[PDB]
Symmetry: D2
């Protein structure tokens, strides 16, 4: 029987998770909790400024019908303690609100029929897994984190390149699309750079590179650090890794190592672009990272720069649902 | 003695009102209520992605020092009933939060030293005045509205052109910069077009043209209607009036009527651009409307199109403080 | 046999015309003249920042293979007098360069196998036709113009509404995406507003409304005028008609007149949006105009505002190829 | 007597060079060659979408009057062989067209009164100098290059950090505003990524890091490489250096080394931002590089990431005029 999931929260990631899950024959979306009105939820699923149009219908009983998920119950309850997925018999919650990113907070979902929660973000005190990196270490934990979109792009690359050449240290920059955490126009924010108009500025902002890699690749965590620069694009981001290796490298040898991994251990997760594409070309791409083959470069015997694209909404959401399928069966 | 004002709310309009008021020798900003931390408030006053840099300092006692307002008390209380401007002896509140846009709601400010409130938006059941249009009809009301930025641009023009040529009917479109009411990326909104990414789309949205003009120009209210189109610019808007008159008009005669008004009854309020400028050129302009002289056109004997720029933040904020000065002395 | 066309010029309109024509079973694109290198042309056909990805292949003999056009000869000759489509046996040229927009200039294509030219723009001294408006008046002219994208949106609407209610006068504004005629950053231009950065500004610019309507709807030409405002979107535009009629109108009656026309005389040309969409939703739409049903409004007995979307690249290009099919058979 | 310069070409860099030079009491702009009409040139000098408004006047004899340059002759001759600055007695040409970036091409300016040329770009076979890096090695060469804006930002930083810690290798990424070399919408370009719409995409593009550093810091040239990512901002860029040193470093020690250099050998050239600003805050900044103090980071004993802002138009133009003053007196 298809795995019975519910999506909590219908902003960018929840909307993308709905669309992704609707296309998976082994999944059934049995419920969605949204703070939007039903008709507005349907409208947002159907029409996306970046990703285009999507088929979705309202059944006669006012459940939704999307892809393989023909009977989706729509809820609207912000209070996680009042929220009740029982009428839908949900087993796995995809937690996409941004408001319960901790073990303690998301553990409130564990009641009634619900067995497991996957949090769409780094989460305090929560077992963290990245598909293709450390997901096989999963051991029946009931609440897990799928890390960040940047960690999903960078951890595969670090694992591949460490296995090939042995990472001594690396520095990461992500040139990253703006998100709904940012401000349209200059106004209060906890981060005084994210305070500033997102569409007008280059905005350096921390990202917890060292700590994230430490969770999924413990040996590499102390060896890497980095930051983000938010820029005026609405979706698709670019990780830029500057690496120092133990083994000597060339542009060609780095290219070959990455291509080999895409054929083998990272098939479906990492890809290679040899066509000289730009960010908009990767809208809706399902990969965690798409290496920019022609821009790989080396200097000295031991250093390389590797860039890779990722659709920070869709690649991540594909991984969320990959992880739901994995933890249900393992 | 300078008029003692306090600014409630420090988003776009509150920040602009602070800067404007700081430059008026007849005003003293005695307090600001902000949900930002003090250092963040100071940072936002000083550095604006659109308007540039502004001088502002922190005094030794942690009041702010800005222009002619050398001793500004900073408060941080969201609850209007707990908020207390007494230590600053504020007399007029400039209400800029967007959360108390009604007579009943803003009347909560009327306590202690506070005599009057000016609301930075249309407000339910509230006496509404536009400077240069109907402000001389003010009659000591304690809570008033300064209408919208679009009404401040369009009502002067309608009054001028009606006086000259007699408006039979008019249709208004504003091509308007995005605001913080909009969404960065597609997500819930009460208005399903304002739901959609502000930086990516042309977004038709109602604006209550008929009702606003009815308040400030009662005879014209039943004769005009219109709408807004939000577009991907961060500031500066453009009103487009399509008018049908009783008297015959030419491009020249419309031009002359508008220019004459700028010399006389609308001096300092309406201006004329003869230099073929574009929207960015009007950042920080203090006028309610800047007519685009060369783009005036007529068709038939009786119809004209008139365009005018306005800085929807700064022109409006200049008027807010003009109105504070007026109601304090009248 | 399919109609043998060649596309001259591969900028925005030429690229779109290629894609459109490739999907028409009654057309064969037998040649393309491009100033790009072959591989770059193929790349531009395949990958579009706005319109997404398109299938296109290089045959073993280095002709292109796109849709129903399996053997497209690629030329690269800027000089219209040296350019020779003979090896491809082209019969109709779709002239998309922007550099030969006159009867005299485009008449240089009339040699060898070429019978007819359709110019992708208003053109001096050239018979002008808009599909659904006056195309049935075509009378075997060898060089014609397909007018502008704005005329293709506005002339259908004016014809519909005139037939229903009798236009006395109308004023048009188009809120229009930027085009490659504009400047990325402030620099020389013949139009000192189009000189200014396209992505940063609202840019009023003439458009020859009166003269265009005069060509296709002679009785209405003296009754209408208007202008354009270029804004920071890359594609999709919005026409805003403010009309004064002889017959009395209501919002409902205008809505009904437009809907009826879409079912009948403007089927496939004009459509109606009842779903409260925004500009990005109309990317790649084939219609000349998509009326915004909910934003129709009236004031007084005789005046209405009507808005309609159009994809200024794709709707226009669909019409270009519609006109090629029509003039080949008529 | 003030140094008599002429500016050849009035796009972004030429316009900025005019404005900069006009404010230098030791310079006289005696002529400008522009392909714009005189009134359009004046308009572009006066009104800038990014940099704001500038005072400039037309004298009675139709020379320009700007700052300290009260009698500027305006020419309009594209052909460098016909162009003649004799009536103005120009001694130094600031070559800003982008069309003569070679020793051979720019040597055509050396005639009549002209003694020296400074090219606003890397130039083939041309002695290259960066102010504060290697300009004191100037030895009366008549045609020189001022390198690129990125080299002006990165070479000071590399020199400072090499002197302090000894660079073993470095990798550079510049997150760079779009320029007029790019395309508004997807169309032909020699670089198939720069072909794609500048305002819509992240666009990786080569930049000749290794070769440039080799010219100005020969010992470091073989040790560094990198690339650019063009993004949707109109001005202000960010260099991101990932460095491996011989000496051990900390965040603090890197911070201190950079701050010390700004007080001493790079005063007026490199600055430090301790105020957590964003890109728009550096519009019109005169520095070659503004280090982002709080975002410096280290990993391992030997690696650091250093970011720095630069206004790619204005910082560079300040250096152009600094170099004109230097080569005139040395
Ligand atoms: N690229 C990305 O966007 C990306 C990638 C990976 C992970 N993430 C992470 O995923 C999380 C969500 O990000 P997002 O970009 O999707 O944010 P978003 O667009 O702001 O969406 C979050 C949504 O959650 C809703 N919500 C808040 N509290 C709720 C509640 N108690 N019950 C139901 N709905 C509630 C909000 O609605 P209201 O406005 O009504 O409160 C909002 O629409 C964040 O932690 C983020 O860091 C984002
Ligand atoms: N062009 C314009 O922007 C324009 C022109 C004329 C009039 N208006 C009107 O003016 C109002 C404000 O607009 P805006 O553009 O300035 O909005 P904004 O940028 O969103 O600013 C509003 C600010 O109010 C703060 N706030 C909310 N509740 C508060 C409270 N109880 N006490 C103190 N601060 C509080 C918000 O902070 P939190 O996020 O912490 O809640 C926010 O920073 C709206 O009614 C708008 O329609 C705007
Ligand atoms: N929305 C629209 O974009 C739109 C809609 C309707 C009509 N139009 C009209 O259609 C025309 C083309 O507009 P567009 O937007 O497609 O412009 P565009 O993107 O600038 O494309 C024009 C292309 O023509 C090429 N070209 C110039 N001279 C040529 C020659 N002699 N032979 C071959 N190719 C040549 C140019 O290449 P080089 O750079 O190598 O010269 C350029 O790539 C204009 O008249 C425009 O007004 C445009
Ligand atoms: N950030 C920057 O923008 C930056 C920084 C440092 C260096 N640079 C370099 O400086 C150069 C200029 O760049 P830019 O950004 O200023 O380019 P731009 O904005 O395109 O300006 C170049 C100008 O040169 C004019 N021109 C071309 N040939 C001419 C001639 N023979 N005589 C007179 N004027 C002529 C062009 O006018 P027409 O269109 O009429 O031909 C155009 O307005 C390039 O080599 C660039 O790499 C740029």
């Amino acid at each position: 029987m298809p795995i019975r999931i519910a999506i909590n929260g219908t902003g960018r990631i929840g909307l993308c998770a709905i669309r992704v899950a609707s296309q998976r024959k082994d999944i059934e979306i049995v419920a969605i909790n949204s703070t939007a009105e039903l008709e507005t939820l349907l409208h947002l699923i159907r029409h996306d400024s970046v990703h285009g149009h999507f088929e979705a219908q309202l059944n006669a009983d006012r459940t939704l019908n999307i892809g393989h998920s023909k009977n989706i119950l729509v809820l609207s309850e912000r209070d996680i303690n009042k929220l009740d997925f029982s009428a839908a018999n949900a087993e796995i919650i995809i937690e996409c609100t941004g408001k319960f990113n901790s073990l303690e907070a998301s553990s409130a979902h564990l009641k009634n029929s619900v067995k497991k929660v996957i949090i769409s973000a780094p989460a305090q005190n929560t077992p963290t897994f990245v598909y293709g990196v450390n997901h096989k270490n999963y051991h029946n934990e009931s609440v897990i984190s799928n890390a960040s979109c940047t960690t999903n792009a960078s951890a595969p690359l670090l694992k591949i390149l460490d296995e090939a050449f042995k990472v001594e240290n690396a520095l990461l920059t992500t040139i990253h699309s703006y998100t709904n955490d940012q401000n349209l126009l200059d106004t209060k924010h906890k981060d005084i750079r994210r305070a500033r108009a997102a569409g007008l500025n280059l905005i350096p902002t921390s990202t917890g590179v060292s700590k994230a890699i430490s969770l999924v690749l413990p040996h590499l965590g102390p060896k890497v650090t980095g930051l983000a620069i938010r820029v005026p694009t609405p979706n698709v981001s670019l990780v830029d890794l500057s690496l120092n290796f133990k083994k000597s490298v060339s542009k060609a040898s780095v290219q070959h190592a990455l291509k080999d991994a895409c054929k083998h251990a990272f098939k479906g997760v990492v890809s290679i672009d040899e066509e000289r594409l730009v960010s908009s070309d990767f809208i809706s791409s399902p990969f965690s990272a798409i290496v920019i083959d022609d821009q790989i470069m080396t200097i000295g015997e031991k250093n390389a720069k590797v860039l890779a694209w990722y659709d920070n909404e869709m690649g991540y959401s594909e991984r969320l649902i990959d992880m739901a399928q994995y933890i249900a069966q393992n």
